[PDB]
Structure formats: C-alpha cells, structure tokens
C-alpha cells in the first residue's frame, strides 16, 4: 500500500513511554507500551478480581460493553522476564494509529501488584514475531500488514528525552526523518521470529572489557534501560565501581558525570553512550547516590544469554525494525 501511519507516545519520567489503543465498539480506550520483546497484546480485564489492587488502579476492558467482541475464552499465562499476567483469549477491533484491525487479545484477569501497580500504561501491545507470541495467536503487526495498507513491512521507534513536548512516536510502514540525522546502518536478525542481532563487543572507556568472543543484543523497546547477563553486569559495574543495590546498582552523583562511555559494536558501527546517556543525574551531591539505567537480565536459552538495548539506547537511536529483510537499523536521533 501507501500508508504510512503514526501512535504518539506519551514519555513518563523517561521510563516508561506508552500511547493509547482502542478496543470494541464503541471504543475502550487503554495506554499500552510497545514491545518488540514480545508479541502478545493484552489489558486488563473487567473479569479481573478487584483483590488485585492493579486492576482497581487500571483502566478494564469489558467485553459486555461491546458489540464486535467475540468470544474465545482459551487460558493464557504471559510470562515476562520481570513480570507474569495471566487470562483468558478475546478478539475485537482495535485502533492504533488510525489503523482498525481485528485482533484477537488477553483479556487479563490475573495483575500482580509488582510491577503493574507501578506502571502508568494498562497493557502491552507486542510488536515480536509470532514465533515468540504465547499460545500461537496472531501478532498484530501480521494482521496490520495482511491488510496491505503499509508503504513497507517495517516499523520504527522515536523516544525523546523527558521534559509542548513529544514523548515519543511510533511509526507504522516507514520511518519519520524529522526525527533522525545521518543514514541508518542495518544488522541482519541473528534468525527471523526475534529482534535479536549479533553484537561484535561492549567497550568501557576503551577497553573491550566485555562480550569479547560476540554476543546477542535483543531490540526491546518494552524495556528502559539497558541490561546484559549477570556475569557481564558485575564486571562492567566493576568498571564503573558502582554499588549494588537490590534491583539496581548506583554510583555517588557527583561522580556521575565523570564514568567512561560505554560503546556496543553493531554490525561495523560503534554505538556510544556517554555518562550523561545513562545516569540518572538527579543532584550532584557527594551525599546522594544515583541510579544507572544499565541492569542484570538473565534471560534463559534459545533466547538468550542476550544483552537487551531498551530505551536508554533507543532514546539515543531512533531505531527501525525491518520485517521485509529481517533487519534492525538505528540512525542518531533528533
Ligand atoms: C514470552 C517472551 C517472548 C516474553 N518476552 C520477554 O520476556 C522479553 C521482555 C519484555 O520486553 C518485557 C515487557 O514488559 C513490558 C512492561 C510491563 C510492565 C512494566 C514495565 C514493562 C516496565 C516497568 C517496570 C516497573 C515499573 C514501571 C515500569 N518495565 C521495564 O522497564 C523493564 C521491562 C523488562 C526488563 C527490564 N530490564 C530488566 S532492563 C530495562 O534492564 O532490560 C525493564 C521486561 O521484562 N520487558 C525478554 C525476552 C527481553
Ligand atoms: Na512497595
Ligand atoms: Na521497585
């Protein structure tokens, strides 16, 4: 087709960028994150007990209030990395960025209040391949390009830095040069079915300290910060002689701006985050410690060990996700 179509993304804190769906008729509105680490589309449910204080707290989708529902009804455990919903399969129209689409969903009725009573989004819509979608259901990228509407099988991801404002953009069939300079440099896809590619190494200051022998790097934009397995994280926090905390690790602030950059070589190009890239600076103080937006994830065989670039890289480079040649690229963003 000729359609190139747009989501806006709000940016809350530069943590957690999400933008709105809409789902049944009419439409129920709900702040999803997109995430190219998974591939499932799920919000809460009105069916979700109210003993889950992150189903009193969010915005529920009530299938009796539609009239294009239509029942599935089959059981779906959703398990993330840092978190699990559970619930039940359901299809119906969705909006997102004036694309309508039938899209069969979770309807979740099981939230833990860890970590959804934290986030500001109710869902997630998944923008992996149906090899990584649960329970085999259609992912809703597939379904849009079904539809033949989009210029190119490809999507792209902007995150502005925190602050009238944009939060961020997701582009649908193309990408937005508004907001990257220079060209875009491609790597393949390690395998179609993840936005997974080879990385070359990980330098700190200079020294390739890490990944030495190569590694994986996961695209996930449903993820802030960047991570890599814990054996790579201890080391490279050595390097930085940050403290670990329990879910993060800190440094004193008025050390902050003065930690190396940390570069991920990418299919022949260096990518470069200074300390000002992945330091939360909130003072400068010798009496305040500040978080680092770099964590441990270990994520388990096929997938990984893999490092994952979530919003702190991406925020960076404005990242596209090529499904026509099993690609990711970046280009600096503006
Ligand atoms: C079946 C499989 C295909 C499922 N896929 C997965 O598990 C993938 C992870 C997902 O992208 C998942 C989406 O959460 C989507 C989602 C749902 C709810 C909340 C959030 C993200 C949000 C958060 C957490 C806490 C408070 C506020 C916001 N989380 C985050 O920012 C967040 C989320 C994640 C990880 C981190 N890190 C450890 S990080 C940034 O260092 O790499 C940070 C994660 O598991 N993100 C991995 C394979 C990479
Ligand atoms: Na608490
Ligand atoms: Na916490």
């Given at each position: 087709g000729n359609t190139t179509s747009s989501v806006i993304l709000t940016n809350y804190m530069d943590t957690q960028y999400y933008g709105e769906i809409g789902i049944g008729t009419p439409p129920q509105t709900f702040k999803v994150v997109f995430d190219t680490g998974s591939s499932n589309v799920w919000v809460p449910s009105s069916?979700?007990?109210?003993?889950y204080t992150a189903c009193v707290y969010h915005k529920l989708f009530d299938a009796?209030?539609?009239?294009?529902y239509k029942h599935n009804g089959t059981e779906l455990t959703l398990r993330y990395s840092t978190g699990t919903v559970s619930g039940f399969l359901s299809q119906d129209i969705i909006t997102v960025g004036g694309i309508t689409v039938t899209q069969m969903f979770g309807e979740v009725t099981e939230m833990p209040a860890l970590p959804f009573m934290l986030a500001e989004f109710d869902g997630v819509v998944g923008m992996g391949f149906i090899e990584q979608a649960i329970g085999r259901v259609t992912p809703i990228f597939d379904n849009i390009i079904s539809q033949?509407?989009?210029?190119?099988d490809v999507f792209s991801f902007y995150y502005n830095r925190d602050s009238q404002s944009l939060g961020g953009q997701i582009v649908l069939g193309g990408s937005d040069p508004?907001?990257?300079?220079g060209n875009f440099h491609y790597i393949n896809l390690?395998?179609?079915?993840?936005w997974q590619i080879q990385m070359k190494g990980v330098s700190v200051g200079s020294s390739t300290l890490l990944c030495e022998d190569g590694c994986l790097a996961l695209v996930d934009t449903g993820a802030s910060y960047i991570s890599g397995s814990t054996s790579s994280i201890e080391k490279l926090m050595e390097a930085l002689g940050a403290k670990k905390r329990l879910f993060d690790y800190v440094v004193k602030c008025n050390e902050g701006p003065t930690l190396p950059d940390i570069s991920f070589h990418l299919g022949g190009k260096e990518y470069t985050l200074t300390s000002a890239d992945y330091?939360?600076?909130?003072?400068?103080?010798?009496k305040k410690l500040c978080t680092l937006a770099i964590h441990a994830m270990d994520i388990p065989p096929p997938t990984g060990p893999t490092w994952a670039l979530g919003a702190t890289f991406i925020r960076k480079f404005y990242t596209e996700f090529d499904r026509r040649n099993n690609r990711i690229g970046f280009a600096l963003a503006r």
């Open positions: 069916k979700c007990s109210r003993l009796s209030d539609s009239s294009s033949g509407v989009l210029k190119e508004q907001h990257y300079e390690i395998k179609t079915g993840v330091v939360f600076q909130e003072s400068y103080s010798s």
